[PDB]
């Protein structure tokens, strides 16, 4: 039951639907750099609490995010050379952040992908870089030798990132640590000669949930399908789980749901 702060940066070279930079605390988005806006912007009410002590938060993040956007344009150009590609549409992605576990141990990561495949990532524990292929070994070079910059990243991942994460969690605890009760509804699909029993489970938060169809009380996976766990616009989640059940046998099947919002698990039949 840990918490994390996570940034996701995306750069595409030939256009589309056209730079993207999003910040999360525990899959709640709290900032984004609108490549239209050229501004790092708040996405939730509680992040403005950063302004009392750090009134420059928005300018600093904006200038840095702008810097990263320009760097990524350069990166996309250099990787074309490294992979000797005359030039199509290509993608550069960067993810980084930290994890603070409930036992007060921490982790962190710092990774780049080219065209959706790993390119290079920092190993915090050896202070070296893992190149995914022989072109990335060009990058592994410059960066393995930049001892000082590699330490800034270890410091950032191990300390700076954790300190902001701990600030953010307090700032946004009322919504970040809330629980919303799952809403479980069982429907029944075809009259004409087996039936599919559908369990819709929606409006729940946080994301973690255990949903199983049972048969005489036991977990059952035969002829069982499930949807995506997908976000509602109000930050809550939705999914479904189905089973094909038998003539005359409906009453053996119940939709079993376990979640932080349920002090006791629920078992819902048609």
């Amino acid at each position: 039951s840990s918490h994390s702060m996570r940034y996701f940066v995306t750069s595409v070279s030939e256009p589309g639907q056209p730079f993207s930079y999003v910040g999360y605390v525990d899959d709640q988005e709290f900032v984004s750099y609108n490549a239209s806006t050229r501004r790092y912007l708040p996405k939730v009410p509680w992040i403005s609490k950063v302004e009392k002590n750090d009134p420059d938060y928005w300018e600093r993040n904006t200038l840095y995010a702008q810097g990263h956007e320009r760097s990524f344009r350069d990166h996309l150009a250099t990787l074309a050379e490294y992979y000797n590609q005359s030039g199509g549409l290509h993608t550069f992605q960067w993810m980084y952040g930290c994890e603070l576990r409930n036992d007060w141990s921490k982790g962190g990561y710092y990774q780049y992908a080219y065209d959706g495949r790993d390119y290079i990532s920092l190993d915090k524990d050896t202070l070296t870089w893992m190149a995914a292929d022989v072109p990335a070994q060009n990058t592994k070079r410059k960066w393995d030798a930049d001892f000082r910059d590699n330490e800034y990243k270890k410091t950032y991942l191990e300390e700076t990132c954790i300190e902001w994460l701990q600030r953010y969690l307090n700032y946004g605890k009322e919504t970040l640590l809330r629980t919303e009760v799952p809403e479980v509804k069982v429907t029944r699909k075809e009259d004409y000669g087996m039936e599919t029993l559908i369990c819709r489970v929606g409006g729940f938060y946080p994301k973690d949930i255990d949903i199983d169809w049972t048969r005489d009380g036991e977990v059952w996976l035969q002829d069982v399908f499930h949807g995506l766990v997908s976000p509602n616009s109000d930050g809550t989640y939705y999914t479904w789980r189905s089973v094909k059940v038998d003539p005359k046998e409906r009453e053996r099947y119940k939709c079993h749901v376990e979640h932080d919002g349920l002090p006791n698990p629920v078992d819902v039949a048609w």
């Binding site: 993040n61 840095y64 810097g67 990263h68 760097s71 250099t78 410059k142 910059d149 950032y156 700076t160």
Partner: peptide, 9 residues
């Protein structure tokens, strides 16, 4: 808070 400035690839 985002990371600071980056180096050429």
């Amino acid at each position: 808070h985002v990371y600071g400035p980056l180096k050429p690839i």
